[PDB]
């Protein structure tokens, strides 16, 4: 659903459970990843992100985040391997960030947050006929999370942040052709994985999370651009889009697997 949920004081994460009871379920996301507790799992096949150069459609400010959607009408742009059984098509990717440098990411590692976190959302189109249907099944979705830390300016990120002024207001969009999501990935394919859920309503527990170990780097300037976005529409009082993240949720005995040893 998408109703009276947001990130404000009255409709924020702490209130979601009222309209979305699944909010206090057995496998909610995000979580705090205690690295020493992750289970090295060598049996898992290599994680592969096979993305196309021009499958991107538009970039949109939907009031919760800035999102880039893709054509999923076919099987070209998918994630596979790792804990996944079969390919999952990329539907869209978006970000979560904070008002300050020490907050922003949804998942945290050993209690530490990153200024932002990228989410590439995929669904099992092979066995379910619609994202809505896949979203209701425990094995219907796969979300790849990528942490962002501030450092060197990120090349492909320039085009994305440059387009943020145009979509500064809620409900606005622009064409965003030929953006290869592969450009927002780190060199390493090491990851952590665990059964979880969507981090925004409906909070469906149908997500196989794959959180990459190595973060990508963007500049503070680029980060500042995300913070210039607004939760509000054109003729409404301005409220900047920041702290659009859900805090860590109870692990509840779940096992986090790792594709590497540390």
Ligand X SMILES: CC(=O)Nc1nnc(S(N)(=O)=O)s1
Q: How many CB atoms lie within 10 A of CB 84?
A: 21
Taking the complex as a whole, the smallest distance from the CB of residue 200 to Zn ion amounts, in Å, to 6
Question: Does residue 15 have an active-site annotation?
Answer: no
Taking the complex as a whole, the smallest distance from the CB of residue 144 to Zn ion amounts, in Å, to 11
Interface with ligand X, residue 119, by CB under 6 A? yes
Q: Is 15 annotated as a binding residue?
A: no
Neighbouring residues of 7: CB distance < 8 A, sequence distance ≥ 6: 13, 64, 231, 243, 244, 245
Interface with Zn ion, residue 119, by CB under 5 A? yes
- The residue among 32 and 158 lying less far from ligand X, judged by its C-beta, is 32
- The residue among 119 and 170 lying less far from Zn ion, judged by its C-beta, is 119
Q: Using CB under 6 A, which residues numbered 39 to 98 contact ligand X?
A: none
Interface with ligand X, residue 121, by CB under 6 A? yes
Interface with Zn ion, residue 107, by CB under 5 A? no
Cα–Cα distance for residue pair 83/210, rounded to 1 Å: 8
- H helix runs in 103-248, sequence order: 131-134, 155-162, 220-227
Q: 143, 184, 185, 210: which one contacts ligand X (CB under 6 A)?
A: 143
State the catalytic residue, choosing from 64, 107, 122, 154: 64
Contact in structure between 51 and 144 (CB atoms under 8 Å):
no
């Amino acid at each position: 659903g998408h109703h009276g949920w947001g990130y404000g004081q009255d409709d924020g994460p702490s209130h979601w459970h009222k309209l979305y009871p699944i909010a206090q379920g057995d496998r909610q996301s995000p979580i705090n990843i205690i690295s020493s507790q992750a289970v090295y799992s060598p049996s898992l096949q290599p994680l592969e992100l096979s993305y196309e150069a021009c499958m991107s459609l538009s970039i949109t400010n939907n009031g919760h985040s800035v999102q880039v959607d893709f054509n999923d009408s076919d099987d070209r742009t998918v994630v596979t391997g790792g804990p996944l059984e079969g390919p999952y098509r990329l539907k869209q990717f978006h970000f979560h960030w904070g008002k300050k440098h020490d907050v922003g990411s949804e998942h945290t590692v050993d209690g530490k947050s990153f200024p932002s976190e990228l989410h590439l959302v995929h669904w099992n189109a092979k066995k379910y006929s619609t994202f809505g249907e896949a979203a209701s099944a425990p094995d219907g979705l796969a979300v790849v999370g990528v942490f962002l830390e501030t450092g060197d300016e990120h090349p492909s990120m320039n085009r994305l942040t440059d387009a943020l002024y145009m979509v500064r207001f809620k409900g606005t969009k622009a064409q965003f052709s030929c953006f290869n999501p592969k450009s927002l990935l780190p060199a390493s394919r090491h990851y952590w994985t665990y059964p979880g859920s969507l981090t925004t309503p409906p909070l469906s527990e149908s997500v196989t999370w794959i959180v990459l170990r190595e973060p990508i780097s963007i500049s503070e300037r680029q980060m500042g651009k995300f913070r210039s976005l607004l939760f509000t529409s054109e003729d409404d009082e301005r409220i900047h889009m920041v702290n659009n993240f859900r805090p860590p949720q109870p692990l509840k005995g779940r096992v986090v697997k790792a594709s590497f040893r540390a």
